[PDB]
């Protein structure tokens, strides 16, 4: 049983050459900037991390974080799959508490890593690899909380903008070598999302359906308008640095590739999502919104994780990836006038994309761990 | 003018690594077998090659062959673009003479190469690269001669079968290292095509429309039935050797790749041609058959030439190639319910595929020529 399962999750060919892993060993983390709300929370997080026992490995906290986040959002998705129903109030509280636990466990893992001398390139790749998967579920859970499924165009834009903004933050890191925090970053967005879930508890659908008297717009467009305003502001800060801050030869990226090369990957994901939406004869997204976002979210999360791998190995990005096979199956199905029911194909695309993400992650983590001789979830 | 034009035809990145070209230098041509009609023509070709002056480089004869073949077929395509009209009789004679000149010039180029000590890996790549382009035009010209455009399903199968059979002959060479001639090969097929053009001169449309009394099938299906029978016979000889004749480790190819890997490339070309045909709302192939065959022919010819390159460099085949961009443009256009007229998109796809083929060929030929220090069209 263990031999077949291990063979199922290992990639047939090693994803990294021997020279990139050695180059990965020479990598040294550099970050700059300070978020607006971060200095107040540091006192809380410094208290919390000191209570964690020293024998707990860093990557085990992260996986606990994801598991709490996945379970609470999947339960919320289970109760409200078209985003029009109302779930029991305690489910939103559980998601609210789960995200607060996630944020608290994320922010202390590197403090535990420092204190215990267990900082490693595996930890950095795993952390940012965990952040990439969590981001799709938090924005989806937000969309459920505001019942944005009744207005799909706003739902489509907001969910994919968050994934695109998160990828673009990592894109800046691929060119410049340094993680730069804005005034509004992950902490402010997540704090805004936890409070929003509590208003969804207090006011329900009548609050969200109430009219804002000054603007004559529905209240549901305000988080989306905040997403528009937030995207423009965040992109402006990020885009100045990609075009002017290239440290490679002749202002190229650190890998010597074109500064526009990561755009094509996330752009292809967003474009494919747009192609399937506007051509669907059965209104696929409107009938099954949560399942669709999860399918392309795993595709998007893997593409982000490949950029992290590309960052850590100082390598080029190949546009051709197996992650697009699942969306292509959906894309080919719509080409034949939906000869098979798209809902069945979407489940096939979901299951494939999930397993393909997990297979890549397990194979990369195991290969690096064997080379550096540490265990991923155990301290020696 | 010369700097911009040279930049237009060179690929931005060198297609071959330094180690594959060195490995290409160690390649030694090996062939086995004898065709049925070849021993009688050898006496004629030995007479002809002795009359060619020794200062003519081999690759210049080949390019003369292609130019005569291209011009005569394009003139025939110019007169009969839907394959239903009748061209003037002298145009078929010119094509008949042109193919006879092609065959005669092809068969003597290696004899000239031997006699003059000018045999080189560039010559072998250029020769098989020239054969791959000529094959699409000869089968297309045959289809014009029999007016097969009135029956598109037979026209589609026969043209693509010839390209697939020719690729498969080279596929056997990629696994086994040796060119194996059958009893029915290029010589017998071309001799059958020259005689067929002369019957098209003698009998015209009434002969081709006459009923065969014993079978109750139209005469137009007989070359296609010969193509079916020929494909089955030829595939049977070829397919035994791919499955049992692998000389690599554990019966793999000489490059260590799966024996099924070349199938995916030519299969994708044939499948794409099939997708665009059956979904077209405007009956695109029936209105513009010659233009369609030329578009996918250049795609198919390049993919064959990449296999030749893959053979000569003992390298793996990458499925991702720029040659598919042109068909994909057509494929994406049909996905949006033909928002642009497919005829215009097909011209765009033709022009792109032609330039992309030429760009690849010029860049590869120039890179190898500079490394081995010979001139492609000039003997020192
Ligand atoms: C801004 N925060 C701190 C609130 C959260 C986002 O920040 P993050 O999690 O991307 O990184 P961070 O600022 O916590 O940095 C912690 C650092 O610890 C290291 N790290 C992380 C995870 C892990 N399993 N092992 C590690 O050694 C990495 O070098 C990481 O960069
Ligand atoms: C069976 N024929 C001979 C009628 C035609 C098909 O055969 P082909 O053209 O593939 O090869 P061939 O049997 O003429 O072999 C001629 C050989 O000459 C060499 N050659 C070819 C072309 C060229 N410009 N320079 C060369 O040195 C190659 O090694 C080639 O293999
Ligand atoms: Mg952290
Ligand atoms: Mg983190
Ligand atoms: Mg020859
Ligand atoms: Mg030849």
Residue numbers in the entry:
A (entry chain A), B (entry chain B): 28 to 407
Publication text:
Choline/ethanolamine phosphotransferase 1 (CEPT1) catalyzes the last step of the biosynthesis of PC and PE in the Kennedy pathway by transferring the substituted phosphate group from CDP-choline/ethanolamine to diacylglycerol. CPT1, CEPT1 and EPT1 belong to the CDP-alcohol phosphotransferase (CDP-AP) family, whose members share a common property of catalyzing the transfer of a substituted phosphate group from a CDP-linked donor to an acceptor alcohol. CEPT1 is a dimer with 10 transmembrane segments (TMs) in each protomer. TMs 1-6 constitute a conserved catalytic domain with an interior hydrophobic chamber accommodating a PC-like density.
We, therefore, incubated purified enzyme with 10 mM CDP-choline and then prepared cryo-samples. Eventually, we obtained a 3D map at 3.8 Å resolution. The overall structure is almost identical to our first structure with r.m.s.d. of 0.4 Å over 368 Cα atoms. However, the lipid-shaped density disappeared in the hydrophobic chamber, and a new density arose in the catalytic cavity. The CDP-choline molecule matches well with the new density. CDP-choline is primarily coordinated by the CDP-binding motif. The cytidine group is sandwiched between TM2 and TM3 and potentially forms hydrogen bonds with Asn86 and Glu151. Minor shifts of TMs 2/3 were observed to leave efficient space to accommodate the cytidine moiety. The pyrophosphate moiety is stabilized by the two metal ions that are coordinated by four conserved aspartate residues from the CDP-binding motif. The trimethylammonium group of choline may also be stabilized by Glu65, similar to what we observed in the PC coordination.
